[PDB]
Ligand binder design. Structure first.
Ligand SMILES: Nc1ncnc2c1ncn2[C@@H]1O[C@H](COP(=O)(O)O)[C@@H](O)[C@H]1O
Ligand SMILES: [Mg+2]
Ligand SMILES: [Zn+2]
Length: 321
């Protein structure tokens, strides 16, 4: 009966607001594996790219194992959530028939690996503490470079190469697209990415017409970035859980900062934090500007998502006075 309940919950895989935490429990802590498998089957990707089912499952479980079990936010559930959110965004009416199967594969694969092996601390923390990762990556997109390297490295494990039947050309193209997409999840690039998305909205032609790698990849970069920053646009019961989790990570990082004699980063001081004010600020300065721009690109497909974001912003704001 546990499998029956899991199957019922997975019927909502094409809908914004999937019960991803329930699926995490019902699947025996395999939300990334079951959601990826479900989406690959729904989009017929196993047949299109000749991916053996056993290879897909082996790779997925291996990848999922490299998400940390003890980080409240940047874990396998976040990976699963970004994957599923990207999957829904890819299906928007305004983008019907716009992307190739390889581009679709790249966006979903990038979403799955996008935060793999995340230590639960920020790039700035890693840079300020002279960490091994920051030393390896010269303080530039430190985590994002690492997520990519691990995600790709795991394809080399026994029976894990899900791209074994792609042509060399397809493999080269996919690799480039995935790198471009995950590097675009680095928050230091948000303002530039948003500025470029706004330029695309202002010069859009129409279903959207996008025929040059530059425009197509920029839309996919922004799409996955929106998925990554989708928690405040989800039904409130989901959003509040994501907030609880990221705040826990923030506070744990702030505890490490305090212990080292460092200045505590914004929102990371458990003795001087306002979770509610931080959410309203995050939505006002980052999430709403981004999602409103995405909504404009695909107008009016994303109106319900934007409306939810706005209702959630109002809800958090109402708790402050
Ligand atoms: N609910 C939230 N409240 C505040 N910041 C968030 C929230 N969700 C995502 N973020 C920020 O956006 C970034 C997304 O990149 P990542 O953490 O690597 O998934 C996080 O590092 C947070 O700083
Ligand atoms: Mg990230
Ligand atoms: Zn992320």
């Amino acid at each position: 009966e546990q499998e029956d309940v899991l199957a019922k919950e997975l019927e909502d895989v094409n809908k914004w607001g999937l019960h991803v935490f329930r699926i995490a429990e019902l699947s025996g802590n395999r939300p990334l594996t079951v959601i990826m498998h479900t989406i690959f089957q729904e989009r017929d990707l196993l047949k299109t790219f000749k991916i053996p089912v056993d290879t897909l499952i082996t790779y997925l479980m291996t990848l999922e194992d490299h998400y940390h079990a003890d980080v409240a936010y940047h874990n396998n559930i976040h990976a699963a959530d970004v994957v599923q959110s990207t999957h829904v965004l890819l299906s928007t009416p305004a983008l019907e028939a716009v992307f190739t199967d390889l581009e679709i594969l790249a966006a979903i694969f990038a979403s799955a690996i996008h935060d793999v092996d995340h230590p639960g601390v920020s790039n700035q923390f890693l840079i300020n503490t002279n960490s091994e990762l920051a030393l390896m990556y010269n303080d530039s997109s430190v985590l994002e470079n690492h997520h990519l390297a691990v995600g790709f490295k795991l394809l080399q494990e026994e029976n894990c190469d899900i791209f074994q039947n792609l042509t060399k050309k397809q493999r080269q193209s996919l690799r480039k697209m995935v790198i471009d997409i995950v590097l675009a999840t680095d928050m230091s690039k948000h303002m530039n990415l948003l500025a470029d998305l706004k330029t695309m909205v202002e010069t859009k032609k129409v279903v959207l017409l996008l025929d040059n790698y530059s425009d197509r990849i920029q839309v996919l970069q922004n799409m996955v970035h929106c998925a990554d920053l989708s928690n405040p646009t989800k039904p409130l019961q989901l959003y509040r859980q994501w907030t609880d989790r990221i705040m826990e990570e923030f506070f744990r990082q702030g505890d490490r900062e305090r212990e080292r004699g460092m200045e505590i980063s914004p929102m990371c001081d458990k003795h001087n934090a306002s979770v509610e004010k931080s959410q309203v600020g995050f939505i006002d300065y980052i999430v709403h500007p981004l999602w409103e721009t995405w909504a404009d690109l695909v107008h009016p497909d994303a109106q319900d998502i934007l409306d939810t974001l706005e209702d959630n912003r109002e809800w958090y704001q109402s708790t402050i006075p």
